[PDB]
Design a protein around this ligand. Structure first.
Ligand SMILES: COCc1ccc(OC(F)(F)F)c(CNC(=O)Nc2c(-c3ccccc3)nc3c(C)nccn23)c1
Length: 299
């Protein structure tokens, strides 16, 4: 997830972390809700999500350290905040900010056409303004990653998290292949590819670039505007590969304005060099997100 893409690492004493309960589980680890003391100056006691490494072998312990360095380097307003590690005695822990709404896919699906409202979100389906705000924030994170020349390779709503006030940030706990196995095509004994999010040059030639990530962001934008539906849900994995390699584009979601569909299409140009940059995609979305209701009401 971090290594092969593209100490400074903060450490937290084990006694400052108090585990409350499990949030999620995977092949390589578990995530807990925890209380963290003395972490931030204003907050004496705050909630965090703690990722526990399952096996602390030499390879895993080295992978953990490389991951920690990279997460320390990747810090920005629309990227999930990494606070540091606890490496004094096993299990090795990585401490992150807690994102109350969970992953963006789950959030979209629970605020769909069928949709209750609450503290951060009105009742019913998410409105155009809110869908645009979600898209814009994900785009802002990709702009920052593109700027560092980091190639994500698994950009999808399942790999974004949603926090209080609907702050949307790019990030995941490395368990998406376990939780969302249907979103991956298993090729090897172990290898699982997110083919539905992948451009033709990633599928055909195995090239992953900043341009392949913008393609994937195009598909993220489609997910947002279909309230988390799977791209190509009607097709098998082999059928999806054929569609993508033959140049079939995803249809415009019912909730998607033509102007927004045009932004998706700009991400899905066959030739990578002809795709619009994520900076330009972010600018168009931010503009739409921030547009007055009078403008947005006729879009
Ligand atoms: C809670 O979000 C934190 C976060 C923040 C930024 C970030 O980078 C980027 F999105 F580019 F900004 C990422 C990238 N995600 C990622 O590296 N996932 C990941 C992990 C892993 C995740 C967290 C801790 C340790 C390992 N392990 C795997 C495996 C074994 N396989 C596939 C992906 N994995 C995560």
């Amino acid at each position: 997830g971090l290594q092969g893409h593209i100490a400074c690492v903060h450490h937290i004493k084990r006694r400052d972390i108090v585990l409350k309960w499990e949030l999620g589980e995977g092949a390589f680890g578990k995530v807990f809700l925890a209380e963290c003391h003395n972490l931030l100056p204003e907050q004496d006691k705050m909630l965090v999500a703690v990722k526990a490494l399952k096996e602390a072998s030499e390879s895993a312990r080295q992978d953990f350290q490389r991951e920690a360095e990279l997460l320390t380097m990747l810090q920005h307003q629309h990227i999930v905040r990494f606070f540091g590690v606890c490496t004094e005695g096993r299990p090795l822990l990585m401490v992150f900010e807690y994102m109350r709404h969970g992953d963006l896919n789950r959030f979209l699906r629970s605020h769909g056409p069928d949709a209750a409202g609450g503290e951060d979100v009105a009742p019913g389906p998410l409105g155009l303004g809110q869908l645009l705000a979600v898209a814009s924030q994900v785009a802002a994170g990709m702009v920052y990653l593109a700027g560092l020349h980091f190639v994500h390779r698994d950009l999808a709503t399942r790999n974004c998290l949603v926090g209080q006030g609907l702050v949307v940030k790019i990030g995941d706990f490395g368990m998406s292949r376990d939780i969302y196995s249907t979103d991956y095509y298993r090729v090897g004994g172990r290898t699982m590819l997110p083919i539905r999010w992948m451009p033709p040059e990633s599928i055909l030639y195995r090239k992953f670039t900043t341009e392949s990530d913008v393609w994937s962001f195009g598909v993220v934008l489609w997910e947002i505007f279909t309230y988390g539906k799977q791209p190509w849900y009607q097709l098998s994995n082999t059928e999806a590969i054929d569609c993508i390699t033959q140049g079939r584009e995803l249809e415009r979601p019912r909730a998607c304005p033509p102007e927004v569909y045009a932004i998706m299409r700009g991400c899905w140009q066959r030739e990578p060099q002809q795709r619009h940059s994520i900076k330009d995609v972010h600018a168009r979305l931010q503009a739409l997100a921030q547009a007055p209701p009078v403008y947005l009401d006729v879009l």
